[PDB]
Amino acid sequence: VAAERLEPRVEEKDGYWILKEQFRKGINPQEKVKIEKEPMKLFMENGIEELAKIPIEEIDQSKLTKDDIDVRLKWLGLFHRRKNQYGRFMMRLKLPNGVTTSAQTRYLASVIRKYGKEGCADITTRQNWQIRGVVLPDVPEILKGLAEVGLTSLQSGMDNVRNPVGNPLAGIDPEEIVDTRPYTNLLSQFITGNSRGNPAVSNLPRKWKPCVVGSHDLYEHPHINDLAYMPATKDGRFGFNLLVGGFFSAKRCDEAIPLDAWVPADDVVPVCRAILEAFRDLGFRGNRQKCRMMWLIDELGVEGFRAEVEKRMPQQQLERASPEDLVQKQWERRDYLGVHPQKQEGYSFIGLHIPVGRVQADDMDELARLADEYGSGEIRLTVEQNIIIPNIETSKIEALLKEPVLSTFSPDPPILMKGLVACTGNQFCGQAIIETKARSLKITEEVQRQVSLTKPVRMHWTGCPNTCAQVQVADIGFMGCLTRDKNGKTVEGADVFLGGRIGSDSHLGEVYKKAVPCDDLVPLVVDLLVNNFGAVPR
């Protein structure tokens, strides 16, 4: 690799970071959008105010403004549902470590309630909230309301740092390694510039996902993150070994690899900055399918990339990885659903199953009420699109278990539901090939009616090859496709994946059977469970 290759490709200009003229040749259309107008201006210069006043039919008549609503607004966490819900926007937060409050939950509920049949909310596979039904004229008021309850939606889509994932049991688990909340909080504050916006990290070549590990269970899925902080002592000091480049895409899935670097705990933000700066400065900006950070690591080599991180550290020093970390390989991932004692004596947390992560406004109000009446007003989201309500006096549990809402959001659902994960799918997502959420519930219900089991089999349903529901981590994964019935008629189908493992001995699953009609999945899955996971016919 030439020294020429290491020339930073972006420069700061008027508070924003833009591609240098000499590196603009051959860029993808999204890069052209970012050059034509800096997306962060919609927030940081209040461009949203004037944009929100223009009727959508008029917005659609010019490239600049159509790109505003279809692309640039994703820097404000707003996602136009052009194909499947025209004129309406999904909105996605920053929610480091999945931690929310009853006040925030009620606020989000009040927004979606306004939109009636066009509104609902979802828990995401990055332990985050999404809301639906948002109309453009309401955006300025929603941004204000979010700020008032201590939320931001900044930089949650497109070429930005995505939600920082942590340990859902942070601070409450007797068995935790390190409380991940301070670190995920610090990362979120850094990424979003304390909710004001941080242009230094908003013009990446592509999305980029961080997590901080605090559990032996590895609830955080470090193996699939662009940066994962693995807790580790080095030379008598607490810090993190760093894994880099993990990602999924339609083209390629790759597990994170060691950077061969360790940082003391206080260097979490400096190293996140250094890595993001290296990626921003040096990343390829052509074919979008070759823009994720792992591709830069492949081009430079891990040592080449490491040197670029090192040069961007304060005092330009980066220690080598510590030989061992604090994560025990001897571990069985713990089921967090149900009632469990906290490390604080006299207190319990409860894990509640949220069927395919979908909630309506009334459901959100009920969950917020439970958190206030029984806990401390806190609600935690998980990457299996479930919830935990922590900080419940254990003496209140008998009463809690009698709450009617717990029949819908159960602390002890059937075992197959506990592990069921499904992406948005074609109810709202324009990329989706099939319907996912309703289908996956119906199929899982019919399968569990036929078999009993004891192994916690994890089933993931994703609507297209983008694999937002991570089918490659599943015991049994289902990827949307169109296929053919016995009469050659078009029907919805799934490619079925097997082999995904999580925790310390992680592994990426692969396609086992292509193009199975959805209507034929029940018998296939019943047999797989009996034949491979010890399930017993009922």
Q: Which does 432 bind (CB under 5 to 8 A by kind): ligand O=N[O-], ligand SF4, K ion, none?
A: ligand SF4
Rounded Cα distance, 406 and 338, in Å: 11
Which one of residues 71, 169, 383, 468 is an interface residue with ligand O=N[O-] (CB under 6 A)?
A: 468
Q: Which of 410, 391, 393 is nearest to 353 (CA)?
A: 410
Stretch of 61-69, 331-339, 362-370, 467-475 contacting ligand SRM, by CB under 6 A? 467-475
3-class state of residue 134 by DSSP:
strand
Breaks (C-N over 2.5 A) in the chain follow: none
Backbone angles phi, psi at 80, to 5 degrees: -60, 125
| Side-chain half-sphere exposure of 353, counting CA atoms within 13 A | 20
Which of 145, 264, 411, 430 lies at the binding interface for Cl ion (CB under 5 A)? 430
End-to-end Cα, the chain, rounded Å: 61
Q: Choose between 125 and 198: whose C-beta lies nearer to ligand SRM.
A: 125
Neighbouring-strand partners of residue 501: 507
Identify how many contiguous H helices and E strands the chain contains and give both numbers: 15, 23
Element (H, E) at 135: strand 129-135
The correct pick among 185, 450, 466, 506 for binding ligand SRM (CB under 6 A) is 466
90 belongs to the binding site for ligand SRM (CB under 6 A): yes
**Interface with ligand SF4 in residues 436-465 (CB under 6 A):** 462-464
Binding to ligand O=N[O-] in span 156-175, by CB under 6 A: 157
- Which of 244, 271, 240 lies closest to 256 in space, CA to CA? 244
Instruction: Between 29 and 404, name the residue whose CB sits nearer to ligand O=N[O-].
Output: 29
Letters for 393-432 (x = contact with ligand SF4 by CB under 6 A, - = none) are ------------------------------xxx---x-xx
Classify strands 237-244 and 16-19 as parallel, antiparallel or unpaired: unpaired
SS (H, E, C) 362-397: HHHHHHHHHHHHHCCCEEEECCCCCEEEEEEEHHHH
Coil vs helix vs strand at 247:
strand
- Which of K ion, ligand SRM, ligand SF4, none is residue 162 near (CB under 5 to 8 Å by kind)? ligand SRM
Nearest residue to K ion by CB is 385
Q: Rounded to an integer, what distance in angstroms lies between the CA atom of residue 201 and that of residue 312? A: 14
Q: Tell me 63's DSSP state.
A: H
CB 394, min distance to ligand SRM, A? 32
The reply on whether position 207 binds ligand O=N[O-] by CB under 6 A is yes
Q: Is 476 helix (H, G, I), strand (E, B) or coil?
A: strand
**Residue 520, class by beta-carbon neighbours within 10 Å (0-12 exposed, 13-18 middle, 19+ buried)?**
middle
Name which of 204 and 521 has its Cβ closer to Cl ion.
Answer: 204
Q: Which of 189, 360, 408, 431 binds ligand SRM (CB under 6 A)?
A: 431
According to CB under 6 A, which residues from 163 to 202 bind ligand SF4?
Answer: none
158 binds, options Cl ion, ligand SF4, K ion, none, Cβ within 5 to 8 A by partner type: Cl ion
Instruction: With beta carbons less than 8 A apart as the criterion, state whether 320 and 262 touch.
Output: yes
- Smallest gap, in angstroms, from Cβ of residue 476 to ligand O=N[O-]? 22
Choosing from 51, 201, 354, 429, the residue that interacts with ligand SRM (CB under 6 A) is 429
Minimum CB distance to ligand O=N[O-] smaller for 65 or for 466: 466
Task: Determine, following the binding rule CB under 6 A, whether residue 130 of this chain makes contact with ligand SRM.
Answer: yes
Which residues are at the interface with ligand O=N[O-] (CB under 6 A)?
Answer: 157, 207, 468
Which residues are at the interface with ligand SF4 (CB under 6 A)?
Answer: 423-425, 429, 431-432, 462-464, 466-469
